[PDB]
Design a protein around this ligand. Sequence first.
Ligand SMILES: Cc1cc2nc3c(=O)[nH]c(=O)nc-3n(C[C@H](O)[C@H](O)[C@H](O)COP(=O)(O)OP(=O)(O)OC[C@H]3O[C@@H](n4cnc5c(N)ncnc54)[C@H](O)[C@@H]3O)c2cc1C
Length: 418
Amino acid sequence: VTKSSSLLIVGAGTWGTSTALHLARRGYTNVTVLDPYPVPSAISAGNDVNKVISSEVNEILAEEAFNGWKNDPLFKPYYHDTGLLMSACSQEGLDRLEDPNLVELTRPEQFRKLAPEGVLQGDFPGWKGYFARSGAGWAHARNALVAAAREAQRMGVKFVTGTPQGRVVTLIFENNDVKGAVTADGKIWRAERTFLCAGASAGQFLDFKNQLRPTAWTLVHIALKPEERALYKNIPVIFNIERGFFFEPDEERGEIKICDEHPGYTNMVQSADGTMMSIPFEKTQIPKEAETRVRALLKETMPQLADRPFSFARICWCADTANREFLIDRHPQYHSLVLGCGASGRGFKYLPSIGNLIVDAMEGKVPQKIHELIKWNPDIAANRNWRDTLGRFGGPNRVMDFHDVKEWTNVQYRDISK
Ligand SMILES: Cc1cc2nc3c(=O)[nH]c(=O)nc-3n(C[C@H](O)[C@H](O)[C@H](O)COP(=O)(O)OP(=O)(O)OC[C@H]3O[C@@H](n4cnc5c(N)ncnc54)[C@H](O)[C@@H]3O)c2cc1C
C-alpha cells in the first residue's frame, strides 16, 4: 500500500466521507467512493438538518471529535454551541445519564426558563436532569457531510454516486480476500484496500458473525410560521432519554426537528435458509406509534406545537454492535478489507475525526487499548440478544420490529438528496 494505491470506499455516508476526507488529507491520491445515492445520501443517517454534539477510549475519541467541531475550519461553520439539557423521568433513566457549566434541574420552572418565555410552555412533569450551558449543542449534519465530501473531492477523491453506477452489488471475493467491489451497472472496481462504510447496509456484503444489528429510529419536522420563528432561535438542545429531543428551527424552512426516544425498530427478514437478518429500507414516513410519541413529548415541552401537522418525516437507520462499541478494524481473514461501521446510533458527532481512526486501522497504527475496544469481535456477538435495548429507553421500552407496524404517517415527500 502506497499513497497512489487504488483505495475503494463502499458508502459515501458519515463514516465513508470522513474516511475519504482523511485519506485525502494524509496524501492518498487514488481514492474512489461508491454510493447508490447522490451526496448527501437520502439513506445516510448523517443526512439530517441537525444532530446532537456533546463534550477511557470513548473519552479520547469523543475529545478528538469535539476538537474537530471547535477547531477544524472545515467543520466549525456547522457547529452551534447552544448548550444541551440531558434529562430523564425515572431513576433508571436518570442513572443512565465540579463542572462550572453543568447545573441540576428538578423543577418545571427551571426547565421552562431554558428558553425565552413562550417557547417551553410545558409542565415537564417529573423531568429531572442536567443542563450543560456550553461545550455541547448541535451540528448541521447534512451541510457538514456535504462540506466534507466536497473537500475530499477537491483534494482528488472520486465520488461515483447514484444508481446503478454507485450501487455495490457484491464485494469481489478472490482467494479468501476482498479485491474491490462490483457495481449494479456491471462495473468492476479493483482496489488494493476496500473500506466497508455502508452503515446499516454493511451486513449485505459479508458475514459479520452476528456483530451488527441494523436498527431504525424516527424523526419529524414541524414548520414554524415566519413570524413565530425568531422566538425559538438559539434555544439549547432539549433531550430526555425516555421521551425524545428537539432543536432550534433550521434556517432553510424554519423547521424544528424532533425525535421520539425508543430502543429502535428492526426489520427481521426470513430467508429460505431459515436464518434471521435485519434488512434496512428507505421510508419517508414513520410508524403511527412514533407520531404519538413525538406528540406526547411536545405536550410535555412545547404543547403549543403538539397538534401541528408534520412537514417531513422519515425513518433513519444505523447498526448496533452487541455493546454499542465501534467496529473499526482490518478483517481477520480478508487481508485487504477494512471495516468502518457499527456506529451504534452514536456516530455522527465523529464525522470530523473518525476517518483518521479508520485510516489508522488500514495502516496498522491503532493504539492497542483503543484497538481492543473497536476490534472485529465475534465472541461478543455469540448467542446474541437481538432484543437487547442497549441502554435505550422510551415508548414500549423494548426493541420493536417494522413487521409489527400496522399504520404509517402520510406526510408529503421531500427528496433530501436534493
Ligand atoms: C434518527 C437518528 C438520530 C441520531 N442522533 C444522533 C445524534 O444526535 N448524534 C450523533 O452523533 N449521532 C446520532 N445518530 C447516529 C448517526 O447518525 C449514525 O451513527 C451515523 O451517521 C452513521 O454513519 P455511517 O457512515 O455508519 O452510516 P450512514 O451515514 O448511514 O452511511 C451509509 C452509506 O452507505 C450507503 N450504501 C447503502 N447501500 C450501499 C451500496 N449497495 N453500495 C454503496 N453504498 C451503499 C448509503 O447510501 C449511505 O450513504 C442518529 C441516527 C439516527 C438514525
